[PDB]
Every structure is written in structure tokens, then in C-alpha cells.
Design a protein around this nucleic acid. Structure first.
Lengths: 114, 116
RNA sequence: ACCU
């Protein structure tokens, strides 16, 4: 997996307002860590869960447009950031645009006070 | 009980799969204090933490050595690569607080891990 | 999904 790619991930079981079920997520961990996790068969990668509920788009969230990829308009929730074992990766879906990824970088900086 | 950035809490990470950090262990709050304040006020929602381990054999650039001289009983390292948002109900107990210097390091460790 |  690579940073910017959209993957179907298994987030269950989730507690409280943690994003649940099997849903798309954007890889945001750097590619050196991603490359290290793949071949070794261990380690974690970091992803940003995605939701179809787009009634509100907070500044720490990024609107993703449906393309081949996501079938409906969605928003990436940087506040839902989560490091997961690679075995949670189910399906490759596609990748966000460079514009969407650049926005996600800013959303992550904002959320993590970086 | 307000959780603040830089503070250390006993968090419940179970159940975990694969190489995911597990069990009930210390973690450093790294989400901004606006989100944090909102989370306590509403009694729900997610805040973001960085898990901590006592296995300090090697400290990677995306990891930060935390001195016991923290609330932590022994020397530990914060694993920015294990960062995850958690529901407030996973917050069990406040433990302590990292120094301003250690937190700055953690910010740098977060930037490196997340390519920011 | 829900909450922000």
C-alpha cells in the first residue's frame, strides 16, 4: 500500500464514535514505513477513515469526489486517524488526487496541532 | 476530567490485531486542545493518542524517549507509528504529562511518520 | 453508522 491510496479497511470492533464496519480509508503513513510493513509481514500502517455523511465538512476533514474509485462523494476524517495492522486491508479502491492529498495534509496538521 | 495535549493517560487499546499496540497502557494525547475540550464537554467523540512502550531498546526517528523523571514508573518511548484516535470511553486514568521538550520532539516524530 |  502507498500513501494517498484508498483501501477498504476492517475497523471493527469500534468503541463509541470510532469509525466502524468495513469502509474506505486513505493511507497517510509514509512510504518507507509502508514498504517496511509489506515485505516483513508485520508492523502497522496509518490510515484516515472515510464517511459518506457529508452534511458537515469540518476544517480537519477533506471532501473526496466520486470517480473506478469511490462511488459517492465522501469526506476523509483526519480526526479518525488510526494505525492498523496490514491484515485489516481488504480491497484496493483507488487513490485520492494530489489536490485531495494536499488538503488532507493540512487537515492532519490542523488536527494534530502540527 | 479534561484531557490535554501532552498529558499521559491509561488507555484501553483492546482488542488489537497483528502488530497493533494492545492492552491497557499509557499514551500521550496528541490531538489539539479544541477537539479535546469539545470531547470532554460532550462526553463523547474521539481524541488522538500515541501509545507508549517500556521496550526502549532502539528509539527510531519516529519515536520519542520519555524520561521516568513523567509519572511513568520506568523509562518509555512514545510510538508515533502506533498513533490512533480513540473514543473518550477508552480513557481510563490520567497518569502524568510529558515535558514541553519531549512534546516538541513528538511533534517532529509525528511529522516524520505522517510525511508532514 | 453515531458525535465533533
Amino acid at each position: 500500500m502507498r500513501r494517498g491510496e484508498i483501501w477498504q479497511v476492517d475497523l471493527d470492533p469500534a468503541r463509541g464514535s470510532e469509525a466502524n464496519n468495513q469502509r474506505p480509508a486513505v493511507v497517510v503513513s509514509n512510504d518507507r514505513a509502508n514498504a517496511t510493513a509489506t515485505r516483513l509481514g508485520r508492523g502497522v500502517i496509518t490510515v484516515v477513515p472515510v464517511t459518506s455523511n457529508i452534511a458537515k465538512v469540518y476544517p480537519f476533514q477533506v471532501l473526496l469526489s466520486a470517480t473506478t474509485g469511490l462511488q459517492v462523494d465522501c469526506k476523509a476524517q483526519a480526526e479518525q486517524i488510526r494505525s492498523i495492522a496490514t491484515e485489516r486491508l481488504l480491497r484496493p479502491i483507488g487513490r485520492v488526487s494530489a489536490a485531495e492529498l494536499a488538503q488532507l495534509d493540512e487537515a492532519l496538521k490542523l488536527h494534530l496541532d502540527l
